[model samples]
Target: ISGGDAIYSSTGRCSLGFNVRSGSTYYFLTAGHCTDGATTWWANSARTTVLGTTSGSSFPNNDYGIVRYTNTTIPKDGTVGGQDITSAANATVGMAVTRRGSTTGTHSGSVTALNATVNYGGGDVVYGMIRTNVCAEPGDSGGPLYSGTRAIGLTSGGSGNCSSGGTTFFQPVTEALSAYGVSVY
Candidate 1:
């Protein structure tokens, strides 16, 4: 129900590519836009280290990136208020959704839509977004989007948080898998 802070990003954006995927270890994924030039992910804010980065990027085609955390020793994981980031890997429309971040501890919402397209002054991309009533902020980008044990997507873009009520989008985990030659069942 919460996302762990295992893998974060180098860029100052909320986009901190993490190892929050289910089943596989090195099989990490994040927004294609999140790969803002970092070669790999880091366990900390300091880019002095690396977890992994764009082994391949398909942006316009798909706003998803496959990041292979080189730190094979430390596989990335999710969390929430110190809770372990464990997910089921599949989500259905109208299901519940939640996320945890350094900015926002934990929040919940309902799945409104699937495979939605959103443009936040940035270019438009066909993202299998999870339209949830949950809210998010700047530093919350690239964070985990979950519902119970299901690891659905990563926080891609959103207008507001639970405070004022807003809509948030995510990068579908299943799509990320097929984009990189992986199976999700």
Candidate 2:
């Protein structure tokens, strides 16, 4: 599935952060916490069509994960919800950015902090996150954080809802891409 679409494992659902590749192998990045819940992911909630498996994940210190696409019959592209992500870049404070998720769809907001850190109790503390004024929800985790064709980060967590608005944190996409030795198409 393309980025921001529903990728599920059993009953749980999470957003696809972005599509990437290393050589010929295809993959997509998502939240580590979300990946921690399930091993295999599917394009639909019914789990009929298999998408891929959780190949690697990181949390607490960093919140990101990668799913290796074992099913090449499915599509894998660099577009996140139809917007082309040419390259991954670092997010800066005061810059306008957009976030796309399966639950929240798309929302725009400005960066609040580049050195942001969040504590989700239970010792789920993530460091060096991109903090933004954009609102997000439960199913939005692992969604793409971008600005037009410039890829930014992955949705980590946030409070409040779209109705009241909220502050959101993102795991920078550059670090994730570098860590996995992958690149956007």
Candidate 3:
């Protein structure tokens, strides 16, 4: 597995955002809701391979988190399912993009809107989301949304599934990277 692939927490599964680094330290980004459920994460379903620990998380208003890698043996690459993520870019309307998630594998779509707000109900309102026609499901959260090698956003939430298509929202990668003072590498 690579970046944008599935990772499991004690609560549930989410897609890895991007391989990030700060000086010598290594980390990855995911949905805050996934991190909110557990501090420890695993690379496999058996929960034997330890991946890392949740270092920082922001949710409700936002939906991204940082995971500090504890196992140095784990491969930290910039590629996600064969897609090379070289840098981060801002989302622009009508820009074509692709997303890689566990539930739905990979899918392509275009940015429908920018800085959109989503209300997941129960006061869970997220702002600055990049809305797209990309279809995603329950297990697709925290997935990568990129255009070519440029990283775009992290999959948040949306209705429906890939079978029927749906509106998916992504938390901008640049924002999360800025919040953690890290960069894609």
Q: Which candidate comes out best when scored by lDDT? A: 2
Instruction: State how far residue 152 of model 2 sits from its true place (Å).
Output: 0.3
lDDT comparing candidate 2 with the true structure: 0.90
Candidate 1: what lDDT?
0.62
Cα error of candidate 2 at position 83, Å: 0.6
Stretches of model 1 off by over 4 angstroms after superposition: 1-10, 13-25, 78-90, 183-185
Ranked candidates, highest TM-score first: 3, 2, 1
lDDT by residue for model 2 (1-185), tens: 67788789765988999999999889999998888857899998677899889999999789999999988688787898889989889999998999999997999999999878899889889999999999999899999999989999999997888989999999999999999999988
Deviation of model 3 at 41, angstroms: 0.5
TM-score per candidate, in order?
0.76, 0.97, 0.97
| lDDT tens per residue, model 3, 24-73 | 99999989888886789889889999989999999979999999999879
The whole-model lDDT of each prediction reads: 0.62, 0.90, 0.90
Q: lDDT per residue, candidate 1, 1-185, as tens digits?
A: 12435345665544443354435645555667666465666656666666666576656435667666566566344544344445446567778777765566577888888767776555656555667788877667666676655567777777866678888877777677665664322
Q: Give Cα distance to truth, residue 101, candidate 2, Å.
A: 0.6
Ranking by lDDT: 2, 3, 1
TM for candidate 3 is 0.97
* Model 2 clashing residue pairs (backbone): none
Off by over 4 Å in 3: none
Worst lDDT 10-window in candidate 1: 13-22
